[PDB]
Amino acid sequence: SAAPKAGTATGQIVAVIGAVVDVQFDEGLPPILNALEVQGRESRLVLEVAQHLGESTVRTIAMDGTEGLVRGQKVLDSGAPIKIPVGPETLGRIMNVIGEPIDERGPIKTKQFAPIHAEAPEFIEMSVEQEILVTGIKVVDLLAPYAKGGKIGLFGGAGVGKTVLIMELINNVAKAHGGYSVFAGVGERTREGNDLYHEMIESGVINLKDATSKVALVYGQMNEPPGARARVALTGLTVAEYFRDQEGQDVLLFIDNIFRFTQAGSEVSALLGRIPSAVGYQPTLATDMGTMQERITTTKKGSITSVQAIYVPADDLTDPAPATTFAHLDATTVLSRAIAELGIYPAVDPLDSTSRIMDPNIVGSEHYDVARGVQKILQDYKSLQDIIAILGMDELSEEDKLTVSRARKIQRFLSQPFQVAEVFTGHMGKLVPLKETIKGFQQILAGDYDHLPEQAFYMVGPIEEAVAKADKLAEEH
Amino acid sequence: SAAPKAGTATGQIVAVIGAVVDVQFDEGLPPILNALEVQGRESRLVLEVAQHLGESTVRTIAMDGTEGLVRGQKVLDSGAPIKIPVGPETLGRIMNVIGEPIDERGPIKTKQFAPIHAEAPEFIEMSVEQEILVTGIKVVDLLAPYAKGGKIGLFGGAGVGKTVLIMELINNVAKAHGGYSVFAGVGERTREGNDLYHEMIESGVINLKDATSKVALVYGQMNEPPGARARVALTGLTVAEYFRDQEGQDVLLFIDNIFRFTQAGSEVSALLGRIPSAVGYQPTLATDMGTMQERITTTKKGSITSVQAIYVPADDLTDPAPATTFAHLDATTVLSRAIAELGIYPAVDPLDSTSRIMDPNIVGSEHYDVARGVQKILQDYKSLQDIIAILGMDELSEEDKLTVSRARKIQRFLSQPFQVAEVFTGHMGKLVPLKETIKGFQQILAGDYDHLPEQAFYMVGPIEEAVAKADKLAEEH
Amino acid sequence: SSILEERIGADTSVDLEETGRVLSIGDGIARVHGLRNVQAEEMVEFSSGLKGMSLNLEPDNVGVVVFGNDKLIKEGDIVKRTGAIVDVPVGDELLGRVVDALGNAIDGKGPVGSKIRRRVGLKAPGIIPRISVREPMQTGIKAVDSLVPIGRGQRELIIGDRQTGKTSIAIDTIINQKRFNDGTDEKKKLYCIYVAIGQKRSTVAQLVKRLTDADAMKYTIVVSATASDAAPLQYLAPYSGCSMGEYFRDNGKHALIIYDDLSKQAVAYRQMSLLLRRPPGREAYPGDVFYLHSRLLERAAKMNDSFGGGSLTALPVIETQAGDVSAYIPTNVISITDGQIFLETELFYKGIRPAINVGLSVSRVGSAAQTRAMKQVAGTMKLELAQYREVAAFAQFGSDLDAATQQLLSRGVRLTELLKQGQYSPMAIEEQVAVIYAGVRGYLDKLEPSKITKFESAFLSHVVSQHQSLLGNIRTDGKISEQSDAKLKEIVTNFLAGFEP
Ligand SMILES: Nc1ncnc2c1ncn2[C@@H]1O[C@H](COP(=O)(O)OP(=O)(O)OP(=O)(O)O)[C@@H](O)[C@H]1O
Ligand SMILES: Nc1ncnc2c1ncn2[C@@H]1O[C@H](COP(=O)(O)OP(=O)(O)O)[C@@H](O)[C@H]1O
Ligand SMILES: Nc1ncnc2c1ncn2[C@@H]1O[C@H](COP(=O)(O)OP(=O)(O)O)[C@@H](O)[C@H]1O
Ligand SMILES: [Mg+2]
């Protein structure tokens, strides 16, 4: 309802220091998490309360520039978390980290607005039902599978996958899928955020005319302070929710980096009066990546086939950032920079890309066996490639020299370039939902078909092309 | 002029804690940077003001032992930075970190004294004119060249180069050069400081009789607190300056370690009430190595062909100490400890020894080409020496086996032992200003002359000696 | 801000509402008293006539970052209000000049009293104002343009270890705008804003003068935050030049801004905060190390016709420590910018200059930048080298393998001598189309290399001496012609036997 007591819910800013504005209320102390309203402004300055410091004073985490703020400025107490307009009347449109229309097409006329801080689905809300969902992407689909209400997560540092694969999945998914779609870009580029808009126009997905828009655009990025990159992923989540719950539909949700919910803490913790930790971080990263990620899940009212992305600071998986997150992704894909060199794209690596839906009952006995066998051969492969033979193959032991043909070709078959990379060489955006994955790949490991001039089968996956390439690049006389 | 207000410029020491003495003035608060005078003393105790803490109290960085100081001792406010006697009437003499005569020959009768804290040369004071200056030292001269008003800098940890090369350059330079010379030893040994004196006597440079002294000796070293090692390099700099400016001459300036200006901060920062940083350091190292080094430069009134030395803590170039400094040296020479093993001396390494005066217009097209080609062959050399062949040369690929003769001999040709190392084996102090560098070295890379029994050409550079050594150590029958 | 008649100021300071008397001070973080109505960033005035901006408004002080060394700022100094968030000078006037980093000129060329300022705190536009990066920007560095094409309105990070070429490249990319800054097509122009952060003020005078030699300085604005300058100057500077170009990115016109050493600003940022006692995080960097280099770059955006059609391309320069490009700050900066040209000292001397590590670098924005010209030629170039990193590092020990494979390796060595751009002169895009194009269309190839450079130098003289038409076809059609291909073919083929008996 948002209404205070019969006393001032107005607080006079007592201290501004970067992304933190301490406020002091004399007749109405406003709760942790409450979205506040800076008066004296020339725009919208909501400061989210964060602590209750005493001496009748809160401590808010500022949602936008704190520029020109003044020690004494009146802060307005609303009476509820930052609540965004949730509904159909916000699809196709673009919303910033508060519910303000950023795509410029004016007011978001809505029946109501949901709070961005809500109690997650309880334990008897959950649903074990793990129904499959094909993406038609070699490793990403066959190797480490996905699933309805599942959780995707890609792991690479700066530019190796993530945004690209999120657009890729958008292709193989976002375009064709019942129900709606959401995309909360957190932290990342404004460029991609714009193109993505326009691409979503050029392809209908976002239609400015009729009312045939299935996606919703919640944004909060880089040119902004941390208090906004912190909650943006929340709004794009407060969005997928209402579509599932109050409008029982199987939404999806694209978060261009969900751990941007953490950089926000790496920028607001210590400046809130906290004692640092892992690399500096916060005594919270856990509950954080926790409390939030424990929202984009299914329930006995609807499903959320969410999709996220997690950055890899200093190229260190050893960072409690991509790591702590692992335990949330119902599919893994740690893309190697050391792989990018090799061209192998997507850079999904043959070890650190797990899953919680890869049993012979859903993915397959044959397929999961060859997967195991792919990685098996791949493991002793990782060793042989260096250990024993020492770089240079050939040597002896055709058993592993077999690996040099099998595993090698395997890496290739899995290096699906796909549509999203069209801007570098306009190459055959290979895909196809399984279909003829049978026979082809199976052949390799057993030895069937495998033997064609190594790199002759590099930039293509489907075995059929081996002979269909042998003509392109031949050898004999 | 140095004179206070019509009120006490006397402050009573309120707190001594090691190299920091807080003082408290009641009727004359003395500015940041002001050199102060401890009364009640049995010598000279100048405490340089550093902060203005409030409660009418400064905070000075003590210039010498704080021993026996007492909470209440009167501190005298002079009215100006630590100002040393600058002039001709200080050449040949030896000055400590305040202008006190340390060579013992009594008063430094001078017309005036310059402040050690002065506004550096502005942007329209600068001069692009980069006129060459030969040192006659293989790598150090040919490879990474020098220049008038340039900036030398050597990078090695404890004992690999630096002091030695500073004496070396002193030989090839200091002795013969128009104008004057200065040597501010910072931090480093008192031994070297004494010998250097005496050597400067034995060779005339410093003449105690006539008045034929071209050098000036400003010292502030190890047996002292950090507040002195901090400014000593400044005085030896306040010295080179007045010779260039007010006495328009092309001075030089030898700083036995200029980053000793930084260890001083690593010893006084946090104890001044600062929050640590890189390895602990200071929120200043930057502006420090900055503000100061932005003094030993030329101008539209005179040039300073300065020479400095920068230590490599923990043998880590990765330390923001040798590093941050790089961007100041108009010539690089990171001497490798891993090189010392190999004997290669000076230990100037084939990659990390750059320059800002190595273009074919000043150093040469031929020479810069062979330099590039020396390092080129040297790079794939660094790889081959291990990668591919695996330690043991021979193998195959005479292309790189050529490198094993070329690059190897190259390393030797550049391993100029020179005069300064006379105390280990009295070896041929090779040098010579270019002269016959033509033909000789050029031959190697192309293949001309190269082939003589590897190490047969180790402790000598000039190719002529290859055959001139083949007799010393022969092989055949 | 004003004072009274009765001597030196008379009435002002009397009220801690609009003024404030310094409490403490040291290491340029004047903890000023009073200043009640100060805003959270309104740059203030000390008694010693010195600037500083109120950065930490607090219950019983304002904690100001002092602009420029301490000496004069002292416990009691009266502080005055300049009610205006961190703003600086801008306009066309600043063209052909060099100033510090707060506005005012330095190069003793007199005043540049501007009448159109520009705050630095501006927010990046957005999804809507920005359109698509089209209408590239020619550097003139063959290896760059053809290989790694830069688009207009985008951030292209140029990373490189000490002494690798990060500034020559940026000095050639700026120098190239020569012909256009007096040519016909006004839209085919470019104004540059060269910023320097850290650098010795003589390295900066090496550039101002050097550029001046090619008259480049005539159509460029250069600004400095050189070592002397207290850490804040070295901090406010990028955000100053950003507002320089924004005149152009908001007025049809366009700009090329070079942020020289954001990493050096990295070294120079952590300072200002630590001294403010804002809890340090990773390697000292104040937590918002992101918002430091994001907030900025996010301003060099492409402008749509409905918003201007202008632009601002920004290449942030970064210090590579031995080769690691993934260090905190570099990650921070490569996790934003689109396209990062890596410069490797490790290569350099080998002749491999500019030395760009394909695989650990990209144009990112895609084929959009590279005009039909490069999309006709360069389309193969970069990715040819991508996987090639293997065979180039494998052929050195190859034997009983794919005999003919030699081709894919041969397309590397020969091509190399042409891909290694390096000189104080840019090669116009239609010239790039002359030489490099000849390579992709395997014609030179087989010939024993080395003399290739003789081609990339002579071919040009050969062109302007007897082939002025060909290039014009680029200025007519705007691609390599079926006809012109035949002709260039008839010229490069002759060069095979041009040194072949
Ligand atoms: N095109 C080129 N080809 C070969 N060498 C070059 C070229 N351009 C410049 N050099 C030289 O190589 C070095 C690289 O330029 P520059 O010195 O500015 O590099 P940087 O990476 O910016 O580092 P820093 O300026 O701190 O030294 C210089 O000595 C420069 O003059
Ligand atoms: N499908 C792909 N195929 C090949 N290379 C790719 C692909 N996607 C990205 N890359 C490479 O990665 C670089 C940037 O990584 P990208 O995936 O776009 O980063 P992110 O998605 O984290 O924003 C590209 O510019 C390109 O070299
Ligand atoms: N010219 C030289 N030739 C060979 N070895 C040298 C030379 N100069 C120094 N060394 C070696 O380095 C050791 C100490 O390093 P030195 O250069 O004297 O240290 P620094 O100059 O930093 O004080 C010597 O005792 C010796 O082994
Ligand atoms: Mg440079």
PDB file of N, CA, C and O in Angstrom, chain A residues 340-371:
ATOM      1  N   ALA A 340      40.282 -20.281 -27.156  1.00  0.00           N
ATOM      2  CA  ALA A 340      40.090 -19.271 -28.200  1.00  0.00           C
ATOM      3  C   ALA A 340      41.241 -19.286 -29.200  1.00  0.00           C
ATOM      4  O   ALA A 340      41.031 -19.160 -30.403  1.00  0.00           O
ATOM      5  N   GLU A 341      42.452 -19.472 -28.686  1.00  0.00           N
ATOM      6  CA  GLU A 341      43.657 -19.523 -29.513  1.00  0.00           C
ATOM      7  C   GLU A 341      43.463 -20.610 -30.563  1.00  0.00           C
ATOM      8  O   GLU A 341      43.679 -20.409 -31.754  1.00  0.00           O
ATOM      9  N   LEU A 342      43.008 -21.756 -30.086  1.00  0.00           N
ATOM     10  CA  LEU A 342      42.771 -22.936 -30.900  1.00  0.00           C
ATOM     11  C   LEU A 342      41.568 -22.743 -31.835  1.00  0.00           C
ATOM     12  O   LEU A 342      41.257 -23.611 -32.652  1.00  0.00           O
ATOM     13  N   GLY A 343      40.875 -21.619 -31.686  1.00  0.00           N
ATOM     14  CA  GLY A 343      39.727 -21.329 -32.526  1.00  0.00           C
ATOM     15  C   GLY A 343      38.445 -21.959 -32.034  1.00  0.00           C
ATOM     16  O   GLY A 343      37.370 -21.377 -32.185  1.00  0.00           O
ATOM     17  N   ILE A 344      38.570 -23.146 -31.446  1.00  0.00           N
ATOM     18  CA  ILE A 344      37.454 -23.933 -30.904  1.00  0.00           C
ATOM     19  C   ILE A 344      36.307 -23.073 -30.356  1.00  0.00           C
ATOM     20  O   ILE A 344      36.372 -22.577 -29.229  1.00  0.00           O
ATOM     21  N   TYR A 345      35.241 -22.931 -31.135  1.00  0.00           N
ATOM     22  CA  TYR A 345      34.118 -22.105 -30.710  1.00  0.00           C
ATOM     23  C   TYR A 345      32.724 -22.704 -30.917  1.00  0.00           C
ATOM     24  O   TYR A 345      32.450 -23.286 -31.963  1.00  0.00           O
ATOM     25  N   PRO A 346      31.828 -22.574 -29.913  1.00  0.00           N
ATOM     26  CA  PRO A 346      32.083 -21.904 -28.633  1.00  0.00           C
ATOM     27  C   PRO A 346      33.247 -22.539 -27.874  1.00  0.00           C
ATOM     28  O   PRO A 346      33.585 -23.693 -28.108  1.00  0.00           O
ATOM     29  N   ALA A 347      33.881 -21.776 -26.996  1.00  0.00           N
ATOM     30  CA  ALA A 347      35.030 -22.274 -26.252  1.00  0.00           C
ATOM     31  C   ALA A 347      34.698 -23.199 -25.079  1.00  0.00           C
ATOM     32  O   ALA A 347      35.461 -23.282 -24.112  1.00  0.00           O
ATOM     33  N   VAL A 348      33.585 -23.920 -25.177  1.00  0.00           N
ATOM     34  CA  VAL A 348      33.158 -24.831 -24.117  1.00  0.00           C
ATOM     35  C   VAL A 348      34.207 -25.923 -23.941  1.00  0.00           C
ATOM     36  O   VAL A 348      34.492 -26.665 -24.880  1.00  0.00           O
ATOM     37  N   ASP A 349      34.778 -25.998 -22.739  1.00  0.00           N
ATOM     38  CA  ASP A 349      35.826 -26.966 -22.418  1.00  0.00           C
ATOM     39  C   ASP A 349      35.378 -28.366 -21.989  1.00  0.00           C
ATOM     40  O   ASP A 349      34.403 -28.529 -21.245  1.00  0.00           O
ATOM     41  N   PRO A 350      36.123 -29.397 -22.432  1.00  0.00           N
ATOM     42  CA  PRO A 350      35.923 -30.829 -22.184  1.00  0.00           C
ATOM     43  C   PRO A 350      36.127 -31.398 -20.773  1.00  0.00           C
ATOM     44  O   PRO A 350      36.562 -32.542 -20.628  1.00  0.00           O
ATOM     45  N   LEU A 351      35.729 -30.654 -19.746  1.00  0.00           N
ATOM     46  CA  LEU A 351      35.883 -31.121 -18.369  1.00  0.00           C
ATOM     47  C   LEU A 351      35.012 -30.290 -17.427  1.00  0.00           C
ATOM     48  O   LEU A 351      34.164 -30.812 -16.712  1.00  0.00           O
ATOM     49  N   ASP A 352      35.184 -28.978 -17.492  1.00  0.00           N
ATOM     50  CA  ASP A 352      34.454 -28.064 -16.631  1.00  0.00           C
ATOM     51  C   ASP A 352      33.079 -27.615 -17.123  1.00  0.00           C
ATOM     52  O   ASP A 352      32.669 -26.477 -16.875  1.00  0.00           O
ATOM     53  N   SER A 353      32.351 -28.512 -17.780  1.00  0.00           N
ATOM     54  CA  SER A 353      31.014 -28.189 -18.284  1.00  0.00           C
ATOM     55  C   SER A 353      30.039 -29.310 -17.900  1.00  0.00           C
ATOM     56  O   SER A 353      29.600 -30.106 -18.729  1.00  0.00           O
ATOM     57  N   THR A 354      29.699 -29.334 -16.618  1.00  0.00           N
ATOM     58  CA  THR A 354      28.834 -30.344 -16.022  1.00  0.00           C
ATOM     59  C   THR A 354      27.340 -30.206 -16.343  1.00  0.00           C
ATOM     60  O   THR A 354      26.974 -29.515 -17.295  1.00  0.00           O
ATOM     61  N   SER A 355      26.493 -30.872 -15.545  1.00  0.00           N
ATOM     62  CA  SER A 355      25.022 -30.839 -15.683  1.00  0.00           C
ATOM     63  C   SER A 355      24.288 -31.664 -14.611  1.00  0.00           C
ATOM     64  O   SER A 355      24.869 -32.545 -13.981  1.00  0.00           O
ATOM     65  N   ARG A 356      22.997 -31.395 -14.442  1.00  0.00           N
ATOM     66  CA  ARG A 356      22.170 -32.114 -13.478  1.00  0.00           C
ATOM     67  C   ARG A 356      20.994 -32.768 -14.211  1.00  0.00           C
ATOM     68  O   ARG A 356      19.939 -33.021 -13.620  1.00  0.00           O
ATOM     69  N   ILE A 357      21.187 -33.049 -15.497  1.00  0.00           N
ATOM     70  CA  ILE A 357      20.151 -33.664 -16.329  1.00  0.00           C
ATOM     71  C   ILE A 357      20.810 -34.485 -17.462  1.00  0.00           C
ATOM     72  O   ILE A 357      20.273 -34.590 -18.571  1.00  0.00           O
ATOM     73  N   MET A 358      21.959 -35.096 -17.160  1.00  0.00           N
ATOM     74  CA  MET A 358      22.698 -35.891 -18.150  1.00  0.00           C
ATOM     75  C   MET A 358      22.649 -37.411 -17.961  1.00  0.00           C
ATOM     76  O   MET A 358      23.605 -38.110 -18.292  1.00  0.00           O
ATOM     77  N   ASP A 359      21.546 -37.933 -17.440  1.00  0.00           N
ATOM     78  CA  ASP A 359      21.442 -39.374 -17.245  1.00  0.00           C
ATOM     79  C   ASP A 359      20.828 -40.067 -18.453  1.00  0.00           C
ATOM     80  O   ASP A 359      19.956 -39.506 -19.124  1.00  0.00           O
ATOM     81  N   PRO A 360      21.254 -41.313 -18.732  1.00  0.00           N
ATOM     82  CA  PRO A 360      20.766 -42.112 -19.864  1.00  0.00           C
ATOM     83  C   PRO A 360      19.251 -42.184 -20.006  1.00  0.00           C
ATOM     84  O   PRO A 360      18.745 -42.636 -21.033  1.00  0.00           O
ATOM     85  N   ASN A 361      18.536 -41.724 -18.984  1.00  0.00           N
ATOM     86  CA  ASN A 361      17.081 -41.738 -18.993  1.00  0.00           C
ATOM     87  C   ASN A 361      16.500 -40.544 -19.745  1.00  0.00           C
ATOM     88  O   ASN A 361      15.387 -40.610 -20.265  1.00  0.00           O
ATOM     89  N   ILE A 362      17.252 -39.452 -19.793  1.00  0.00           N
ATOM     90  CA  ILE A 362      16.804 -38.247 -20.478  1.00  0.00           C
ATOM     91  C   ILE A 362      17.689 -37.854 -21.665  1.00  0.00           C
ATOM     92  O   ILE A 362      17.174 -37.457 -22.714  1.00  0.00           O
ATOM     93  N   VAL A 363      19.012 -37.952 -21.499  1.00  0.00           N
ATOM     94  CA  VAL A 363      19.949 -37.613 -22.577  1.00  0.00           C
ATOM     95  C   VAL A 363      20.306 -38.828 -23.430  1.00  0.00           C
ATOM     96  O   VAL A 363      20.587 -38.687 -24.622  1.00  0.00           O
ATOM     97  N   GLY A 364      20.358 -40.006 -22.810  1.00  0.00           N
ATOM     98  CA  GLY A 364      20.659 -41.212 -23.563  1.00  0.00           C
ATOM     99  C   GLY A 364      21.829 -42.057 -23.098  1.00  0.00           C
ATOM    100  O   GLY A 364      22.853 -41.535 -22.666  1.00  0.00           O
ATOM    101  N   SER A 365      21.662 -43.374 -23.193  1.00  0.00           N
ATOM    102  CA  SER A 365      22.688 -44.344 -22.815  1.00  0.00           C
ATOM    103  C   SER A 365      23.833 -44.301 -23.835  1.00  0.00           C
ATOM    104  O   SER A 365      25.000 -44.179 -23.474  1.00  0.00           O
ATOM    105  N   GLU A 366      23.482 -44.393 -25.113  1.00  0.00           N
ATOM    106  CA  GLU A 366      24.453 -44.336 -26.204  1.00  0.00           C
ATOM    107  C   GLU A 366      25.190 -42.996 -26.127  1.00  0.00           C
ATOM    108  O   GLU A 366      26.398 -42.943 -25.912  1.00  0.00           O
ATOM    109  N   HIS A 367      24.425 -41.915 -26.259  1.00  0.00           N
ATOM    110  CA  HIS A 367      24.946 -40.551 -26.213  1.00  0.00           C
ATOM    111  C   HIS A 367      25.753 -40.236 -24.952  1.00  0.00           C
ATOM    112  O   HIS A 367      26.818 -39.628 -25.046  1.00  0.00           O
ATOM    113  N   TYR A 368      25.240 -40.593 -23.779  1.00  0.00           N
ATOM    114  CA  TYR A 368      25.978 -40.302 -22.559  1.00  0.00           C
ATOM    115  C   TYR A 368      27.224 -41.171 -22.496  1.00  0.00           C
ATOM    116  O   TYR A 368      28.243 -40.755 -21.954  1.00  0.00           O
ATOM    117  N   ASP A 369      27.171 -42.341 -23.126  1.00  0.00           N
ATOM    118  CA  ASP A 369      28.329 -43.220 -23.139  1.00  0.00           C
ATOM    119  C   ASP A 369      29.411 -42.592 -24.007  1.00  0.00           C
ATOM    120  O   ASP A 369      30.548 -42.457 -23.563  1.00  0.00           O
ATOM    121  N   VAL A 370      29.062 -42.190 -25.230  1.00  0.00           N
ATOM    122  CA  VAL A 370      30.042 -41.569 -26.120  1.00  0.00           C
ATOM    123  C   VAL A 370      30.544 -40.264 -25.523  1.00  0.00           C
ATOM    124  O   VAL A 370      31.688 -39.897 -25.730  1.00  0.00           O
ATOM    125  N   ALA A 371      29.691 -39.580 -24.763  1.00  0.00           N
ATOM    126  CA  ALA A 371      30.076 -38.332 -24.104  1.00  0.00           C
ATOM    127  C   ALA A 371      31.185 -38.687 -23.117  1.00  0.00           C
ATOM    128  O   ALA A 371      32.281 -38.119 -23.160  1.00  0.00           O
TER     129      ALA A 371
END
